[PDB]
Amino acid sequence: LRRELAIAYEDSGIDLLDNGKFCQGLAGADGAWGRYEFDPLGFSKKTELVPYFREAELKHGRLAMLAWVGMVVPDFVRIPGEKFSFEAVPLPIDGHDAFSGATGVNAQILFWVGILEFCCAKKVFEWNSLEVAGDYGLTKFFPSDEEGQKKMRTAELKNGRLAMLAFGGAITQAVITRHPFPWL
Amino acid sequence: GGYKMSPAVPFLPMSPALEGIPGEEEGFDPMGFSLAIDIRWLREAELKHGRVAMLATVGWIATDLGLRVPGEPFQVSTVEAHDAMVKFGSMPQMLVWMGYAELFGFLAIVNMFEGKTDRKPGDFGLRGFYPQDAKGQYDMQVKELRNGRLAMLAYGGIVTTAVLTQEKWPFFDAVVN
Amino acid sequence: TAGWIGWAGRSYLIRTNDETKELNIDVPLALTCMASGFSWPVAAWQEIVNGEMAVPSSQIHPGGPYTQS
Amino acid sequence: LEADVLEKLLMNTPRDQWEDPPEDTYLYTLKTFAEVYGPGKATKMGWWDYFRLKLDLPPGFELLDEDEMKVAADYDKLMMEGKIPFAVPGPAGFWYTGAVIQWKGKEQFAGDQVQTLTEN
Amino acid sequence: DERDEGLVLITPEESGKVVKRDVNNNPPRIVMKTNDWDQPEIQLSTGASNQINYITPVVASDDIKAWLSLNVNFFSILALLTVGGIIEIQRFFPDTLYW
Amino acid sequence: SSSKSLPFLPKPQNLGGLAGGDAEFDPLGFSDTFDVKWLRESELKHGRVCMLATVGFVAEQYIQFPGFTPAEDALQAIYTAPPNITALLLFACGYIESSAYDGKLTMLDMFDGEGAKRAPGDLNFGKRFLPGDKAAADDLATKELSNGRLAMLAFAGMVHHNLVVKGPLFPLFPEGWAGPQGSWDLDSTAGALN
Ligand SMILES: CC(=O)O[C@H]1CC(C)(C)C(=C=C/C(C)=C/C=C/C(C)=C/C=C/C=C(C)/C=C/C=C(C)/C=C/[C@@]23O[C@]2(C)C[C@@H](O)CC3(C)C)[C@](C)(O)C1
Ligand code: KC2
Ligand SMILES: CC1=C(C#C/C(C)=C/C=C/C(C)=C/C=C/C=C(C)/C=C/C=C(C)/C=C/[C@@]23O[C@]2(C)C[C@@H](O)CC3(C)C)C(C)(C)C[C@H](O)C1
C-alpha cells in the first residue's frame, strides 16, 4: 500500500543494502502477458540511484505527456491573442523561436518552472526513496487497493514512456515535414 | 504519525526552526533557508523588508497619484525622483538618518543574538493599538507579516510595471501585446 | 604635536608594562593616554625636574664589556 | 565500494597497512565508514553524506594497475641494485633507450667510478 | 552545546543498534572524533533527516572588539584617519595661502 | 533590563547615580568604556560653554562693544574681533581651566587620588544658591543638564544655519531663499559619478 508521505519519510535516504528484486521491486517492469525486466545495460544495478532513476523517469514521462499534447493542441486551437494567432505562428515547432528572448512569453514559463523545481529539489534529493519516488501527495483518484495502486502506477509509467518516445517522434517529424498535427 | 508536514508544501516536512514563530500556520520553506540561517536573523530581515516595502509602496502610489510636497525640485516623476533628489540633496540626508536608525537596529540585533536582552526578532518596543491578550498579539504579528509580504510583492510589481509601461500607479490604461 | 605623540606613547608604555598589552592594545587606556597627552609640556618638565623622567645609567644596560672582568 | 575497486585498493595498499591504515588513505576512509555502515548497522545514509562518501572514496581508474605496479617495482629494484635504465635528456624531457647499464663502478662508494658510455 | 540538544548522538560502536528517533523525528546521528582542532567532531546521518545545520559562523562582538584591539587594526585605523585628515585639510585650504 | 530611552537595548549599568540619567541613554557604551566622572564633567562643560555661546551668538549680531567692528554673520565675528581681546578671552579661559582643576587637567590626572571625591561637574562656583533639600538640588542639576544639552544642539543648529544661509542668524529664510541644495557643493564620489 501507499502510506502518507509523513510516515514514508521515516525510512528515507540512500539505502546501502539491496532488496534482492529487479530494480528493488519498483513498479513498471511488467510485460503484457508476463514479467518484462528491461535493463540491458544494467543501470538498475546501482540500487542507491534506483530511486533517483525512477524519479527522473516519471518526471520525463509526465513532461513529455504534457509536451505531446502541447504539440497537438495548438494547431487545432490557439490562445485568443494576436501573437499566438496562426498568422503570427504557423506551427507549434515555431513557438520556441517566436517566444524566445525579449518577448518574455517563454521566459515567464521558464521562470515559474525553475521556481517549482527549486522548491521540489528538497524532495528529489533528501526525501527520495523506493516508495516515495515520484510521489508528491497528489493522490486524488488513486485507488485504495494494493493491486489498484500498482496498476495505476504501471499505467502512468507505460503512458509516460509511450509519450516519451512519441514526443521525439512527433517533434522530429514536424521539423522534417513542416506539417500539421498528423505528422506530430 | 511521522514528520510534521508543511501546510504550504504538503510533500515536505516542516522545518523545525519555524515552529512557535508567528507565521508558522503556513510553514512555507521548501528551499530550507531556515535550516541554514538563524530564524531570528531571517525574521528580522523579513520584518525590515516588509515595513520598508509597505512605506515604499504607499509612497510610490502617492507620488504616482500626485501629491508632491511644495517646491520646484520635486516636480519630477516617481521613476526619476531617486536621481533628482540624490542631486537635490534630500536623499543623502535621508540616508544619514537611515544610517543612524540602522546603527540602533544593528545594536539591537547584536544584543539579541548575544542574549543580553530578551528581544524578539523585529521588536523595537513600540506598543500602539497592540492587543493585550496573547492570541491578539499573535494575530497582530501575523497581520504585520502578511501585509509586509503583500507590500514586498506589490512594490516589486509596481516598480517593474512602472519602469516598463511608463504609466502611472494603476497601470490599468496600459498597452501590452 | 610631536611631543603629544611621544608623551602619549610613553605613558601607555609605562601604564601597561607588558608585551601582551603591547601586542593587543588596551584601546580604552590608549585613548585615555592620547587624550591626556595634551599637557605634555608641563607634565614632562615636572617629571624631568622631579626625577621621574630619566633613570640613572646604572639601572640600564650600558653596552658591551670593553675590559677584563 | 565496488568489489573490483576494493580489490584494486587492497592490492595497491601495502599489506601491513590493512590492519590499521594511516589516517589519510582511501583504505582508512573505507574502514571508518564500513565500521559504521553495512549489514547489522546503519542501512541508510543521507543523500549528502552518501554523496560526500562517493566523492572521497577512490574510483577504479584512480588506482595503479598490476602492470603499472610491476613496472614501478622493477624500476625501484633496478635503481637500488645500482643499475640504471639508460635514458638521454631530450627536449624538456628524457627518452628511454631500452638499455640497462651498470651505474655503479668497481668501487661502489666512489663517485669517480660511476660508469658512463662517454668515459667507460 | 545548544545546537545539538535533543539530538540522539550515537557513537560509532552503537551504529544501527539504536534506532530511536530524535525530538525532531530524525534518526540518530553517528558522532566521530576527527582529531582536528578546526573540526573536532563530525556527524553522519543514519537516514533522511530534517534538522537545522547553520552555515553561518558564530561571531561575537567581544571577539570583533578584540580583533580590532589588535595593534594592527588600531594603528591602521589611526593612520587612515590621520591621512584622511591631512588630505581633507589639503582640499579645504589648498596652497597654504594663509601662511 | 532594557534601557528606558531605548527599550530594545540593554540598560547601561555604569552611569547610575548621576543627575539627568532618568532616560538611561548610552547605546554605544561610552560610560562602560571610559570613566563616567570624566564623561559627566565634559558634558557639563560643553553644556555651559554652549549655552553661553548661544546667548553670545544671538547678542553679537545686534550689540557689540564700543568699537569692535560688527559681523552680522556671527561666525565671522572671530575674525572681525580685536585679536588682542580674543587672546585675552583665551587667556582668561586658560586661567580658569588650570585653577579649577589645580593642575590635574588630563583624562588620567583629574579624578585621580585627591580630587576624585569631587563631584563630576562641581567647580564650587555659585554653590551658595544650591537648594538644601536633595530633591530640589537634583531637580536643579537636571535642569542644568537639560538646558546645556538643548544649548549644545541649538548652537550646532545656529552655526549650520549660518553656514547654509551664508548670512545672519535672525532672518531664518533670507530674501529669495530657495533651499539649501547649493551649499554643499564640493565634489563627492557619487556626486561626481552622477
Ligand atoms: C556667585 C556666582 O557664582 O554667580 C552665580 C550666578 C547665578 C546666576 C546664580 C548662576 C547661574 C546660572 C546661570 C548664569 C545660568 C545661565 C543659563 C543660560 C545662559 C542658559 C541658556 C540657555 C540657552 C538655550 C537653552 C538656547 C536654546 C536655543 C535654541 C533652542 C535655538 C534655536 C534656534 O537657533 C536655532 C538652532 C536656529 C535658528 O534659526 C532658530 C532658533 C529657534 C532661534 C551661578 C551658576 O550660580 C553662578
Ligand atoms: C529481446 C528482444 C526484443 C526485441 C528486439 C523487441 C523489439 C521491439 C520493437 C522493435 C522492433 C518494438 C516496437 C517493441 C515493442 C514492444 N515490446 Mg518488445 N522486443 C523484445 C522483447 C520483448 C519482451 C520480452 C517484451 C516486449 C514487450 C513489448 C511491448 C509491450 C508493452 C506492453 O503493452 O506492456 C511493446 C510495445 C513486452 C510485452 O508484453 O509485449 C507483448 C514484453 O514483455 N518485447 N519490441
Ligand atoms: C524544435 C526545436 C527544438 C527542440 C527540441 C526537442 C524538445 C527535441 C526533443 C527530442 C527528443 C525527445 C527525441 C527523442 C528521440 C528518441 C529516440 C531516438 C529513441 C530511440 C529508440 C530506439 C532506437 C529503441 C528503443 C527500443 O529498443 C528499446 C530500448 C527496447 C525495446 O524493447 C523497444 C525499442 C525497440 C523501442 C528547440 C531546440 C527547443 C528549438 C529549436 O528552434 C528547434
Ligand SMILES: CC1=C(C#C/C(C)=C/C=C/C(C)=C/C=C/C=C(C)/C=C/C=C(C)/C=C/[C@@]23O[C@]2(C)C[C@@H](O)CC3(C)C)C(C)(C)C[C@H](O)C1
Ligand atoms: C502591484 C499592483 C497593484 C497592487 C497592489 C497591492 C496588493 C498593494 C498593496 C499595498 C500594501 C499592502 C500597502 C501597505 C501599506 C501599509 C502601511 C504604510 C502601514 C503603515 C503603518 C504604520 C505607519 C504604523 C505604525 C505603528 O505601528 C507602529 C510602528 C507602532 C505603534 O505606534 C502603532 C503604529 C500604528 C503607530 C494593483 C494596483 C492592484 C495593480 C497594479 O497594476 C500593480
